[PDB]
């Protein structure tokens, strides 16, 4: 029926398959998924297992889990291991280098040391620590192993290649990648230290304890820290050499089977977890430590689908393994600024950006995407850099990572002006329409820039909430054009555009022109900036559907329930919206600004005529890459954090709005527990 075959790696491994199939067969129901075991040599086959369909599922190490969404096997972490406690729970853990009491050395002495590493390619045992040893390991860095080889003076590095690069193999014969050979893993590399063959062991933080008991026996042992002082193993929090995420349960990216797998664990955890006993336990085993999932876990949590490899690992990590793959050293360097890359979403925002890169020689290089949140993806990853973004998803991006760089400014042309405190954010109705009004909209048709946009969804979303305390938006309008919204809900029964509902260009009301038109066309209420009817109205905008368009035809609703022209945004408008700011990662915030600071000059509101010369803040068509209404990228004055850029009384309304969130994104960026 449902199986989960599971992949275990070698003999040990296998016995304690057996036991957990047969432990599950006694509490799953006939149906509830059932265990095979697969036995494989190493990881590595159990890898090449899943992506073959010969076996569904393997726990692995992060630095693992890379390796494992490479192509062509692509696979992706599905379940994630994490420690610290049933009520407490993290999803890292520390990388340690574990050493004798009385040896002296520092961190800096590994020189000729002997070496005891968990395996090739993991993250506290190869990963961190060869990786900060890199830079001055014997400049022919290519291939890693021969320099390592060459920096200590014998080793035992399960998986390695022990052919090539024997000294790898010196304190344990053949590199063994399983825990069939005595110095495999967090426990042999442990051993490796303890029967002295080698003088340093790099582990986690839990490995001493998971196998000496005594306090009186973990005092012979110390840790190494980064300042090269040493410090007790009680200290690890003070004397660790870097935090990596935890280990996960692996699965192809199509047809992996994830809910199984998921069900599986979830059961397994409530019945054989850490706070049961029983003859069998899932975290312990008599035939050995860490065996399918690390003793030192206490349970699992469900990682969340938008999540790939890169996403799950996330950005230091992935560029410190990239790096050290790759011999790529930051030795005393200087100048990544060469260009900045440019995220665009569909076609348009491509064409412009094309255009802007071909007229600065390259200073700006385009990445594109589909959506937003794609987008967002690109830059969280390296990527791409830099995009502009309403402050809706300015509120996702930070929760990602990102930062804020610069702000759109509307109101002045004077470029040192401070950021705004933000537009006017109404709701548009036809004058025709003679009974709508705030009170009223239940049931009404509604048209929206975008799902998670401030003036088209956050602002008036989360006031309407407030008021009907629930989340079911698409049941309290009749029907909808929100692009970005399920293409089969109500609020995507108004849209248009070829690409129907997508959060776009390829669908025609999108953005704030695009909800204008949807309210022309079809809606009662469009919800956007309030400079957008005059944007739109007067012939100011030439296209068949607004060109003969009249500012008197429309009013405002206000939130006393009255109407009032258009003219009186000020007077009636539902609130003020932090301005769209551009966003990028730290490392790069500041060649992005200093770059676009200075393309500003020759292409910003100066520009006396677009139709010659190049224009960043005018589109071909409305919006692209920054809003048209823009006059000036200002500097943001010490507001460079998400939090202080949008402004506590922003934060606040978006939070209340969580709960209804359905951005795949945003539950990726909030599933690390730090
Ligand atoms: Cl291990
Ligand atoms: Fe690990
Ligand atoms: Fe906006």
């Given at each position: 029926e449902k199986t989960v075959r599971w992949c275990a790696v070698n003999d040990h491994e296998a016995s304690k398959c057996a036991n957990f199939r047969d432990s599950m067969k006694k509490v799953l129901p006939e149906d509830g998924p059932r265990i095979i075991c697969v036995k494989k040599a190493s990881y590595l086959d159990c890898i090449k297992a899943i992506a073959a369909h010969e076996a569904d599922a393997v726990t692995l190490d992060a630095g693992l889990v890379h390796e494992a969404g490479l192509t062509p096997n692509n696979l992706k972490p599905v379940v994630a291991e994490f420690y610290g406690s049933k009520e407490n729970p993290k999803t890292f853990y520390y990388a340690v280098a574990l050493v004798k009491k009385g040896s002296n050395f520092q961190l800096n002495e590994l020189q000729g040391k002997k070496s005891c590493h968990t395996g090739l390619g993991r993250s506290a045992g190869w990963n961190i620590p060869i990786?900060?040893?890199?830079?001055?390991?014997?400049?022919?860095?290519?291939?890693?192993?021969?320099?390592?080889?060459?920096?200590?003076?014998?080793?035992?590095?399960?998986?390695?290649?022990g052919a090539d690069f024997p000294q790898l193999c010196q304190l344990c014969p053949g590199c063994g990648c399983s825990s069939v050979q005595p110095y495999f893993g967090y426990s042999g590399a442990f051993k490796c230290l303890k029967d002295?063959?080698?003088?340093?062991?790099?582990?986690?933080?839990?490995?001493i304890?998971?196998?000496?008991?005594?306090?009186?026996?973990?005092?012979?042992?110390?840790?190494?820290?980064?300042?090269?002082?040493?410090?007790?193993?009680?200290?690890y929090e003070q004397c660790?050499?870097?935090?990596?995420?935890?280990?996960?349960?692996?699965?192809?990216?199509?047809?992996?089977?994830?809910?199984?797998?998921?069900?599986?664990?979830?059961?397994?955890?409530?019945?054989?977890?850490?706070?049961?006993?029983?003859?069998?336990?899932?975290?312990?085993?008599?035939?050995?430590?860490?065996?399918?999932?690390?003793?030192?876990?206490?349970?699992?949590?469900?990682?969340?689908?938008?999540?790939?490899?890169?996403?799950?690992?996330?950005?230091?990590?992935?560029?410190?393994?990239?790096?050290?793959?790759?011999?790529?050293?930051?030795?005393?360097?200087?100048?990544?600024?060469?260009?900045?890359?440019?995220?665009?979403?569909?076609?348009?925002?491509?064409?412009?950006?094309?255009?802007?890169?071909?007229?600065?020689?390259?200073?700006?290089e385009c990445e594109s995407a589909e959506t937003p949140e794609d987008c967002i993806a690109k830059i969280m990853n390296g990527?791409?850099?830099?995009?502009?973004?309403?402050?809706?998803?300015?509120?996702?991006?930070?929760?990602?990572?990102?930062?804020?760089?610069?702000?759109?400014?509307?109101?002045?042309?004077?470029?040192?002006?401070?950021?705004?405190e933000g537009y006017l954010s109404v709701a548009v109705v036809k004058k025709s329409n003679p009974d709508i009004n705030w009170n009223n909209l239940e049931g009404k048709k509604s048209c929206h820039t975008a799902v998670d946009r401030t003036a088209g969804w956050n602002i008036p979303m989360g006031l309407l909430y407030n008021?009907?305390?629930?989340?079911?938006?698409?049941?309290?309008?009749?029907?909808?054009?929100?692009?970005?919204?399920?293409?089969?809900?109500?609020?995507?029964?108004?849209?248009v555009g070829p690409s129907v509902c997508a959060p776009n260009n390829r669908e025609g009301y999108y953005g704030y022109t695009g909800a204008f038109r949807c309210l022309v066309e079809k809606g009662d209420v469009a919800f956007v900036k309030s400079q957008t009817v005059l944007q739109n109205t007067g012939g100011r905008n030439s296209e068949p559907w607004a060109k003969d368009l009249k500012e008197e035809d429309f009013e405002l609703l206000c939130l006393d329930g009255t109407r009032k022209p258009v003219s009186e945004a000020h007077n009636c408008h539902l609130a003020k919206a932090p301005n769209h700011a551009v966003v990028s990662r730290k490392d790069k915030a500041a060649c992005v600004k200093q770059k676009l600071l200075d393309l500003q000059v020759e292409f910003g509101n100066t520009v006396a005529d677009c139709s010659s010369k190049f224009c960043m803040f005018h589109s071909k068509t409305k919006d692209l890459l920054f809003r048209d209404?823009?006059?000036?990228?200002?500097?943001?004055?010490?507001?460079?954090?998400?939090?202080?850029?949008?402004?506590?009384?922003?934060?606040?309304?978006?939070?209340?709005?969580?709960?209804?969130?359905?951005?795949?994104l945003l539950e990726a960026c909030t599933f690390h527990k730090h």
């Open positions: 990786g900060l040893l890199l830079c001055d390991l014997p400049e022919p860095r290519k291939p890693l192993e021969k320099a390592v080889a060459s920096f200590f003076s014998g080793s035992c590095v399960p998986c390695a290649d002295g063959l080698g003088d340093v062991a790099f582990v986690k933080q839990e490995t304890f998971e196998n000496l008991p005594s306090k009186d026996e973990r005092d012979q042992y110390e840790l190494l820290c980064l300042d090269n002082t040493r410090k007790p193993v009680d200290e660790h050499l870097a935090r990596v995420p935890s280990h996960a349960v692996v699965a192809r990216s199509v047809d992996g089977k994830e809910d199984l797998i998921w069900e599986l664990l979830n059961q397994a955890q409530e019945h054989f977890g850490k706070d049961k006993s029983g003859d069998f336990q899932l975290f312990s085993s008599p035939h050995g430590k860490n065996l399918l999932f690390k003793d030192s876990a206490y349970g699992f949590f469900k990682v969340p689908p938008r999540m790939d490899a890169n996403l799950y690992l996330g950005y230091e990590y992935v560029t410190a393994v990239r790096n050290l793959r790759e011999g790529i050293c930051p030795d005393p360097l200087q100048d990544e600024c060469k260009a900045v890359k440019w995220c665009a979403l569909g076609h348009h925002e491509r064409l412009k950006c094309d255009e802007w890169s071909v007229t600065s020689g390259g200073l700006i990527e791409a850099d830099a995009m502009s973004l309403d402050g809706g998803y300015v509120y996702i991006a930070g929760q990602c990572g990102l930062v804020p760089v610069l702000a759109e400014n509307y109101e002045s042309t004077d470029c040192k002006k401070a950021p705004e008021r009907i305390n629930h989340c079911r938006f698409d049941e309290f309008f009749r029907q909808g054009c929100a692009p970005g919204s399920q293409k089969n809900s109500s609020l995507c029964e108004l849209c209404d823009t006059k000036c990228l200002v500097d943001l004055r010490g507001k460079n954090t998400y939090e202080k850029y949008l402004g506590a009384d922003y934060i606040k309304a978006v939070s209340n709005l969580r709960k209804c969130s359905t951005s795949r």
